[PDB]
Ligand binder design. Sequence first.
Ligand SMILES: C[C@H](CCC(=O)NCCC[N+](C)(C)CCCS(=O)(=O)[O-])[C@H]1CC[C@H]2[C@@H]3[C@H](O)C[C@@H]4C[C@H](O)CC[C@]4(C)[C@H]3C[C@H](O)[C@]12C
Ligand SMILES: C[C@H](CCC(=O)NCCC[N+](C)(C)CCCS(=O)(=O)[O-])[C@H]1CC[C@H]2[C@@H]3[C@H](O)C[C@@H]4C[C@H](O)CC[C@]4(C)[C@H]3C[C@H](O)[C@]12C
Ligand SMILES: C[C@H]1O[C@@H](n2cnc3c(N)ncnc32)[C@H](O)[C@@H]1O
Ligand SMILES: C[C@@]1(C(=O)O)N[C@H](C(=O)O)C[Se]1
Ligand code: MET
Ligand SMILES: [Cl-]
Length: 346
Amino acid sequence: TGREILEKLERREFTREVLKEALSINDRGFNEALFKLADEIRRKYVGDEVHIRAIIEFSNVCRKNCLYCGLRRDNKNLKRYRMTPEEIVERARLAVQFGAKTIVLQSGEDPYYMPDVISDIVKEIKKMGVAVTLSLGEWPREYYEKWKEAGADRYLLRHETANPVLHRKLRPDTSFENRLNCLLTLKELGYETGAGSMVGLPGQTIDDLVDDLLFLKEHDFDMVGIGPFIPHPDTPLANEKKGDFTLTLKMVALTRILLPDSNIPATTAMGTIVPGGREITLRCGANVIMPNWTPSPYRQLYQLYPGKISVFEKDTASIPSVMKMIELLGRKPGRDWGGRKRVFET
Ligand SMILES: C[C@H](CCC(=O)NCCC[N+](C)(C)CCCS(=O)(=O)[O-])[C@H]1CC[C@H]2[C@@H]3[C@H](O)C[C@@H]4C[C@H](O)CC[C@]4(C)[C@H]3C[C@H](O)[C@]12C
Ligand SMILES: C[C@H](CCC(=O)NCCC[N+](C)(C)CCCS(=O)(=O)[O-])[C@H]1CC[C@H]2[C@@H]3[C@H](O)C[C@@H]4C[C@H](O)CC[C@]4(C)[C@H]3C[C@H](O)[C@]12C
Ligand SMILES: C[C@H]1O[C@@H](n2cnc3c(N)ncnc32)[C@H](O)[C@@H]1O
Ligand SMILES: C[C@@]1(C(=O)O)N[C@H](C(=O)O)C[Se]1
Ligand code: MET
Ligand SMILES: [Cl-]
């Protein structure tokens, strides 16, 4: 019964069987109650502020070949770009002028910048009195150390899938063990660390989703980014099925229940598979939004998956748009950098 599973989630009895049953039950009443539970936990632990992280996707060059990703090195049907360090710093300054209190720098795994150009950019943005989050992939410990000394605050490195076998198949350059080692290094170096996964990958099972939730809970990540897999036509997974929105939403809800004081975005991928999907997600456990701040002409060239929303509008539309979103949801913009505010419990 769904009622018993809800009761067990409310009492914090997070067993593998409870999580599996929550993900397996398709009843509308159960799902809606699960979403309401997550929404209420969010409100109680992290409040009504929705934190805005402005993302600058500064290079679409990548040395890796992940099977799901439109930026994979084997994709020749993509114009590659690199923003200059001046462009990046000035684009970050514009976001700070527009009210962003975190700047996220994301790229393909592009050797050009690494490590010293990143360090220089980070130092310049940190002068602006905002948080800096990096999302640059897997690099040596030394690189991560240099970026932390340069002033970076946070690092996003989704774990993608906690099934090592599936991970290696989808990410043939690397392994789950290396991904985890990177995440543990980042945590040791004092970053606020973000993990997370895709839902609906080819070959991924419900039990794999449970393992993603247990992985996240085990490592107590500061941020958890979850979205559906969206097939990209210039990849080997072009003909695979999209991930299910509702199932993905359930993963966000369960993440909030498991990690009640974490920061959880309503991802652009959620807003891409379903119109209004980010807004739904912000009402089912999420408390962060990441407006795209990549300038034209580059924005349209950074498509990990197709259909990405926010491409046709002026490149300064996203921050005002999310501020309108936050208001029409009855929520408030973040007042500070939106770092994790831990609530120690039992
Ligand atoms: C907006 C729609 C439709 C509501 C509706 O239209 N229902 C009839 C009208 C009811 N009114 C009170 C307005 C008038 C009643 C008098 S009347 O004469 O119209 O019958 C309702 C129906 C189901 C609702 C979601 C679920 O809960 C799950 C989840 C819980 C979270 O916490 C918040 C997010 C989320 C996604 C909810 C959002 C929203 O809330 C939904 C979509
Ligand atoms: C960038 C330009 C020129 C002036 C400038 O360079 N301004 C730096 C402001 C720096 N901060 C954001 C840190 C101020 C915080 C003040 S606050 O009192 O809000 O704490 C200024 C002039 C008018 C400003 C917009 C409007 O206002 C409306 C709206 C208010 C929201 O809120 C944030 C978004 C938005 C669209 C604003 C963005 C930006 O800002 C604008 C374009
Ligand atoms: C930046 C994050 O984007 C996600 N990502 C990469 N490719 C896709 C895709 N085809 N569909 C959805 N999400 C994807 C990965 O989870 C990555 O970590
Ligand atoms: C920024 C990001 C996140 O969840 O942190 N969201 C992106 C998206 O959904 O497009 C892919 Se990574
Ligand atoms: C553009 S994908 C996200 C950044 C990095 N390449 C990663 O895979 O973690
Ligand atoms: Cl962040």
